[PDB]
Amino acid sequence: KRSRKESYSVYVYKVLKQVHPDTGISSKAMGIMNSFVNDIFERIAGEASRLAHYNKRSTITSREIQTAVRLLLPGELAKHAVSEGTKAVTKYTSA
Amino acid sequence: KRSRKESYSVYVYKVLKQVHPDTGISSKAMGIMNSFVNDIFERIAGEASRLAHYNKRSTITSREIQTAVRLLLPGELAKHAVSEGTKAVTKYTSA
Amino acid sequence: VLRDNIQGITKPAIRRLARRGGVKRISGLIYEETRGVLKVFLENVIRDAVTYTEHAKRKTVTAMDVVYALKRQGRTLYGFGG
Amino acid sequence: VLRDNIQGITKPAIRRLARRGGVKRISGLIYEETRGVLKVFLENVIRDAVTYTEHAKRKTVTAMDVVYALKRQGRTLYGFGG
Amino acid sequence: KAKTRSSRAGLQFPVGRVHRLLRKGNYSERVGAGAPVYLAAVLEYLTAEILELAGNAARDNKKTRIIPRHLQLAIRNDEELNKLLGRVTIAQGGVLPNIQAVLLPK
Amino acid sequence: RAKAKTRSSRAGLQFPVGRVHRLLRKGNYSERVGAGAPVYLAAVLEYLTAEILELAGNAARDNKKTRIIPRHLQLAIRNDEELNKLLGRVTIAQGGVLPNIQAVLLPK
Amino acid sequence: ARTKQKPHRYRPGTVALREIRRYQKSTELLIRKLPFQRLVREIAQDFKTDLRFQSSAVMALQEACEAYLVGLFEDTNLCAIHAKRVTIMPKDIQLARRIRGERA
Amino acid sequence: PHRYRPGTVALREIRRYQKSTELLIRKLPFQRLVREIAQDFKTDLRFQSSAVMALQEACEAYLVGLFEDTNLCAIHAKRVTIMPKDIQLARRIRGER
DSSP result, G15-27: HHHHHHHHHHH--
Residue type, E29: E
Chains A and F touch (3+ CB pairs under 8 A): yes
> How many whole angstroms separate alpha carbon G82 and alpha carbon G77?
9
Helices (H), chain G: 14-25, 33-47, 55-82, 90-100
Which residues in chain F touch residue H55, judged by CB atoms under 8 angstroms apart?
A: none
Residue type, B12: V
Residue of chain B whose Cα is closest to the Cα of E48:
B15
Phi and psi dihedrals of E65, rounded to 5?
-170, 130
Q: Are H56 and H30 in contact (CB under 8 A)?
A: yes
User: Which residues pair with residue C61 across a beta bridge?
Assistant: G53
Residue of chain B whose Cα is closest to the Cα of E33:
B61
F105 in reach of chain H (CB within 8 A) = yes
Of residues G42, G56, G88, nearest to C23 (C-beta)? G88
End-to-end CA distance of chain B: 42
Q: Are H93 and G74 in contact (CB under 8 A)?
A: no
- Residue D78: in which H helix or E strand, if any? strand D76-78
SS3 call for C48 = helix
> Do F99 and H21 make contact, defined as CB atoms within 8 angstroms?
no
Which residues in chain A touch residue D81, judged by CB atoms under 8 angstroms apart?
A: 31, 35
> Do E87 and C79 make contact, defined as CB atoms within 8 angstroms?
no
Contacts 24+ apart (CB under 8 A), H10-15: H10/D19, H10/D24, H10/D25, H11/D24, H11/F101, H11/F105, H11/F106, H11/F107, H13/D15, H13/D16, H13/D19, H14/D19, H14/D20, H14/D22, H14/D23, H14/D24, H14/F101, H15/F99, H15/F101
> Do F10 and A95 make contact, defined as CB atoms within 8 angstroms?
yes
Chain F stretch 53-82, residues whose beta carbon is closer than 8 A to a beta carbon of chain H: 70-71
Burial G29-45, CB ≥16 within 10 A → b, else e: ebbeeebbbebbbbbbe
Residue D21, CA distances (Å) to A86, B84, C17, H11, H69 in order: 44, 47, 36, 11, 9
Q: Are G64 and C75 in contact (CB under 8 A)?
A: yes
Q: Domains in chain C: how many in total?
A: 1
> Do F89 and D22 make contact, defined as CB atoms within 8 angstroms?
no
F94 in reach of chain H (CB within 8 A) = yes
Angle at E97 between CA G19 and CA C72, to 5 degrees: 105
Evaluated on CA atoms B32, B33, B34, B40, the torsion sign reads positive
Residues in chain G: 104
> Do H90 and G75 make contact, defined as CB atoms within 8 angstroms?
no
> Do A28 and F94 make contact, defined as CB atoms within 8 angstroms?
yes
> How many whole angstroms separate alpha carbon D30 and alpha carbon E95?
34
> How many whole angstroms separate alpha carbon H77 and alpha carbon G27?
35
Q: Domains in chain F: how many in total?
A: 1
3-state secondary structure chain H: CCCCCCCHHHHHHHHHHHHCCCCCCCHHHHHHHHHHHHCCCCCCCEECHHHHHHHHHHHHHHHHHHHHHHHHHHHHCCCCEECHHHHHHHHHHHCCC
Of residues G82, G91, G100, nearest to H89 (C-beta)? G82
> How many whole angstroms separate alpha carbon B16 and alpha carbon B33?
11
A11 in reach of chain D (CB within 8 A) = no
Which residues in chain B touch residue C67, judged by CB atoms under 8 angstroms apart?
A: none
Chain B stretch 49-68, residues whose beta carbon is closer than 8 A to a beta carbon of chain D: 51, 54-55, 63, 67
Query: What architecture is the A1-95 domain classified under in CATH?
Result: Orthogonal Bundle (1.10)
CATH for E88: 1.10.20.10
Chains A and D touch (3+ CB pairs under 8 A): yes
F107 in reach of chain H (CB within 8 A) = yes
> How many whole angstroms separate alpha carbon A43 and alpha carbon D71?
13
D82 in reach of chain A (CB within 8 A) = yes
Which residues in chain D touch residue A36, judged by CB atoms under 8 angstroms apart?
A: 78
Resolution, expressed in angstroms to one decimal: 3.9
> Do G47 and C81 make contact, defined as CB atoms within 8 angstroms?
no
CATH for G49: 1.10.20.10
H52: domain range? 14-97
The 8-class DSSP code of residue G101 comes to T
Interface test with D, best of B61, B69, B70, B82 (most D CBs within 10 A): B70
Q: Are H85 and G82 in contact (CB under 8 A)?
A: yes
Residue B73, CA atoms < 13 Å, CB-side half-sphere: 22
F43: domain range? 1-106
- For residue C35, how many other CB atoms are within 10 A of its CB? 15
Examine residue G48 and state whether it is found in any structural domain, yes or no. yes
The burial of C56, by beta-carbon neighbours within 10 Å (0-12 exposed, 13-18 middle, 19 or more buried), is given as middle
Examine residue G7 and state whether it is found in any structural domain, yes or no. no
> How many whole angstroms separate alpha carbon C7 and alpha carbon B61?
57
Residue of chain E whose Cα is closest to the Cα of F32:
E26
Examine residue H33 and state whether it is found in any structural domain, yes or no. yes
Interface test with C, best of E85, E89, E95, E99 (most C CBs within 10 A): E89
Residue G102, CA distances (Å) to A74, D51, F102, G62, G67 in order: 15, 32, 20, 20, 16
F28 in reach of chain E (CB within 8 A) = yes
Residue of chain F whose Cα is closest to the Cα of D71:
F90
B70 in reach of chain D (CB within 8 A) = yes
> Do A55 and C56 make contact, defined as CB atoms within 8 angstroms?
yes
SS3 call for C47 = helix
> How many whole angstroms separate alpha carbon E53 and alpha carbon E79?
12
3-state secondary structure chain E: CCCCHHHHHCCCCCHHHHHHHHHCCCCCCEECCCHHHHHHHHHHHHHHHHHHHHHHHHHCCCCCEECHHHHHHHHHHCHHHHHHCCCEEECCCCCCCCCCCCCCCC
Of residues C51, C56, C68, nearest to A70 (C-beta)? C51
Phi and psi dihedrals of B62, rounded to 5?
-65, -20
Q: Domains in chain H: how many in total?
A: 1
> How many whole angstroms separate alpha carbon E48 and alpha carbon B18?
9
Residue type, G17: L
D33: domain range? 1-82
Residue type, B15: V
Q: Are G35 and C5 in contact (CB under 8 A)?
A: yes
Residue E80, CA atoms < 13 Å, CB-side half-sphere: 14
CATH for C19: 1.10.20.10
Residue A8, CA distances (Å) to A13, A33, A34, F70, G73 in order: 9, 8, 6, 17, 47
The 8-class DSSP code of residue C76 comes to E
Examine residue H3 and state whether it is found in any structural domain, yes or no. no
> How many whole angstroms separate alpha carbon H46 and alpha carbon F4?
50
This structure was determined by: cryo-EM
- Residue C78: in which H helix or E strand, if any? strand C76-78
- For residue C44, how many other CB atoms are within 10 A of its CB? 12
Of residues E92, E93, E95, nearest to G24 (C-beta)? E95
